[PDB]
Swiss-Prot record:
Keywords: Cytoplasm, Nucleus, Transcription, Transcription regulation, Translation regulation. This is Negative regulator of ofd1. Residues 7-16 have a biased composition (Basic and acidic residues). Required for correct translation termination. Positive regulator of the stability of the N-terminal transcription factor domain (Sre1N) of sre1 which is released from the membrane and enters the nucleus to activate hypoxic gene expression. Also acts as a direct inhibitor of ofd1. Functions probably by inhibiting the ability of the ofd1 to accelerate Sre1N degradation in absence of oxygen. Its main location: cytoplasm. GO terms for cellular component: cytosol; nucleus.
Length: 352
């Protein structure tokens, strides 16, 4: 029940740890950051950088003109943190405006430090939790890169390096994913891009996590992507970005079960059903995507999903259906002028 939602939710957090181990000026800070994201979306990244540094300078100015900085709301630290992270994100251009002793990673560290400073402030915490999560996740990505490229780190296991920030990210994502956290406009598909770092980390090093941990953390991710666009009046364009991430997450999870299949001999039945289930969640989401953006090359993706179903299903009747659906999707794509790679071409020939 409702008390069970908290009893199980609590078990998720437990296994998770074990597994991983005036004022109106605030609204206007956010506006500057939001506008920087509008420019980024329009691919004018120089302007996006200007708006970002503008946000930071305005944050500094609010701070020095505030009698008591401990009264600045969480949303102030959240906006400032988000601006700092955006400098890291756009660092290739942003570095041009800075002294040479500056790094992308240092801006990620600052974004983390600034959001953490908000943990103490008054006010709604949603935007802060999102800022914290986004910054922790960019830190993960950079640590992965440092692990592959810095000689000092070569012999430290990636997971050892990175799990503490993965754990912190999940600590702040989990509450945002709850239905008790009402939607809020900083929760955009754009803002959730760092969720890809978490997904692939889990995928790439899933071999060290329980199944239950994966299912727990993956449903957090899915829940967030979906929430960023549940308002039925979200423009299709944004719905698209979220649904493609959800689809990536479903196919990734299917592939994880299919991987266990292609090794271990137990329990094929269990593994086949779970894999199929995610593959079918994929078809559903793909269909949702296809209504949002009917584009013939997408049919090749449907075909891939159906071939995976064909590959693992245990009854011939279903297998024949899947293969036929794949074939039909591939032919229609081609009939709509989509270039078929030799793979696909040969599958249509091999089939009929």
């Amino acid at each position: 029940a409702s008390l069970k939602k908290q009893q199980q939710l609590e078990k998720q957090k437990q296994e998770a740890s074990y597994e991983l181990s005036e004022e109106d000026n605030i609204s206007q800070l956010w506006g500057l950051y939001e506008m920087s994201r509008e420019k980024l979306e329009n691919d004018d990244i120089d302007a996006s950088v200007s708006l970002v540094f503008g946000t930071i300078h305005e944050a500094d100015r609010i701070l020095r003109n505030t009698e008591d900085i401990s009264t600045l709301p969480k949303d102030f630290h959240a906006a400032y943190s988000s601006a700092l992270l955006a400098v890291s994100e756009l660092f290739e251009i942003a570095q041009k405006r800075l002294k040479e002793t500056n790094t992308e990673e240092s801006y990620i560290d600052a974004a983390i430090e600034r959001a953490q400073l908000g943990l103490d402030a008054p006010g709604n915490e949603s935007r802060l939790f999102l800022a914290l999560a986004r910054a922790y996740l960019e830190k993960v990505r950079v640590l992965v890169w440092r692990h592959d490229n810095e000689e000092s780190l070569a012999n430290i296991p990636v997971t050892q390096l990175v799990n503490p920030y993965i754990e912190k990210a999940i600590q702040y994502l989990r509450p945002l994913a709850q239905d008790s956290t009402e939607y809020f406009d900083a929760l955009t598909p754009d803002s959730l891009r760092p969720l890809y770092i978490l997904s692939s980390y889990l995928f790439q090093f899933g071999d060290q996590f329980s199944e239950a941990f994966l299912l727990d953390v993956c449903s957090i991710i899915t829940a967030l992507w979906l929430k960023s666009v549940v308002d039925p009046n979200t423009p299709a364009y944004y719905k698209l970005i979220a649904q493609e991430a959800v689809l990536n997450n479903y196919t990734t999870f299917a592939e994880y079960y299919m991987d266990l299949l292609d090794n271990s001999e137990s329990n094929v039945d269990d593994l086949i059903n779970k894999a199929s289930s995610w593959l079918n969640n994929s078809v559903d989401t793909w269909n949702v995507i296809y209504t949002l953006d009917k584009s013939p090359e997408r049919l090749l993706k449907l075909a891939d999903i159906k071939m995976d179903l064909a590959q693992i299903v245990q009854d011939e009747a279903s297998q024949d259906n899947y293969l036929k659906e794949a074939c039909n999707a591939i032919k229609e794509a081609q009939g709509s002028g989509v270039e078929l790679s030799p793979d696909y071409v040969e599958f249509v020939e091999a089939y009929s």
